[PDB]
Design an enzyme around this catalytic site. Sequence first.
Site, short mmCIF file in Angstrom:
data_model
loop_
_atom_site.label_atom_id
_atom_site.label_comp_id
_atom_site.label_asym_id
_atom_site.label_seq_id
_atom_site.Cartn_x
_atom_site.Cartn_y
_atom_site.Cartn_z
N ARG A 29 40.28 -0.65 115.31
CA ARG A 29 40.16 -2.04 115.66
C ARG A 29 40.66 -2.14 117.09
NH1 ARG A 29 40.47 -6.64 117.34
NH2 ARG A 29 40.43 -8.59 116.08
N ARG A 81 43.34 0.42 109.75
CA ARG A 81 42.46 0.64 110.94
C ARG A 81 43.35 1.10 112.12
NH1 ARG A 81 39.39 -5.13 111.40
NH2 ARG A 81 41.62 -5.74 111.43
C1 LIG Z 1 43.99 -6.52 116.61
C2 LIG Z 1 44.93 -6.55 115.41
C3 LIG Z 1 44.52 -7.07 114.18
N1 LIG Z 1 45.41 -7.07 113.16
C4 LIG Z 1 45.12 -7.71 111.87
C5 LIG Z 1 45.60 -9.15 111.89
C6 LIG Z 1 44.53 -9.87 111.09
O1 LIG Z 1 44.74 -9.68 109.67
P1 LIG Z 1 44.42 -10.85 108.56
O2 LIG Z 1 42.96 -10.87 108.44
O3 LIG Z 1 45.04 -10.40 107.26
O4 LIG Z 1 45.18 -11.95 109.24
C7 LIG Z 1 43.28 -9.08 111.35
C8 LIG Z 1 42.38 -9.56 112.49
O5 LIG Z 1 41.28 -8.65 112.43
P2 LIG Z 1 39.74 -9.05 112.45
O6 LIG Z 1 39.53 -9.88 113.69
O7 LIG Z 1 39.02 -7.78 112.22
O8 LIG Z 1 39.66 -10.07 111.29
O9 LIG Z 1 43.73 -7.74 111.60
C9 LIG Z 1 46.69 -6.51 113.30
O10 LIG Z 1 47.49 -6.51 112.31
N2 LIG Z 1 47.09 -5.97 114.45
C10 LIG Z 1 46.25 -5.91 115.50
O11 LIG Z 1 46.71 -5.45 116.55
CA LIG Z 2 37.08 -10.29 115.01
#
Ligand SMILES: Cc1cn([C@H]2C[C@H](OP(=O)(O)O)[C@@H](COP(=O)(O)O)O2)c(=O)[nH]c1=O
Ligand SMILES: [Ca+2]
Length: 135
Positions: A29, A81
């Site tokens: 991600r 991820r």
């Molecule tokens: C970019 C990023 C996303 N995330 C998590 C937070 C959000 O989880 P929740 O969905 O449970 O809130 C989600 C956002 O990702 P997406 O934009 O793929 O949805 O991924 C992290 O934990 N750390 C990160 O650095």
């Molecule tokens: Ca997104």
Amino acid sequence: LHKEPATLIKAIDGDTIKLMYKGQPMTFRLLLVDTPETKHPKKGVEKYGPEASAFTKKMIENAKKIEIEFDKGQRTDKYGRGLAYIYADGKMINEALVRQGLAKVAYVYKPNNTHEQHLRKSEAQAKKEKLNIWS
Ligand SMILES: Cc1cn([C@H]2C[C@H](OP(=O)(O)O)[C@@H](COP(=O)(O)O)O2)c(=O)[nH]c1=O
Ligand SMILES: [Ca+2]
């Protein structure tokens, strides 16, 4: 921070890419950015979501060399991820999306904020230029 090689498996959307890293398939991600939603029914397909998706796909498939760069803190999120800055021929996809107004700076979680100011400056320019998300 340092860059490490990786090979493409599949681009999933604007900010999520499956890569082969150290000979294991991992989903990555992008750090510090959010491209609009296209998978989850709770948000639906958001405007520019599909556009962000096609931009990343395009950029990562045409690359000679793909590299990932972890930041100083956690290297995975709660979904397992990998969290990284990803580069396609030395061009950071996280920045390139933000510069097009195809992603916003988001999910800024210390200590993984090394490129935060860099990204914010690209966002400020896309906003001033009224691009895509900012139009
Ligand atoms: C970019 C990023 C996303 N995330 C998590 C937070 C959000 O989880 P929740 O969905 O449970 O809130 C989600 C956002 O990702 P997406 O934009 O793929 O949805 O991924 C992290 O934990 N750390 C990160 O650095
Ligand atoms: Ca997104």
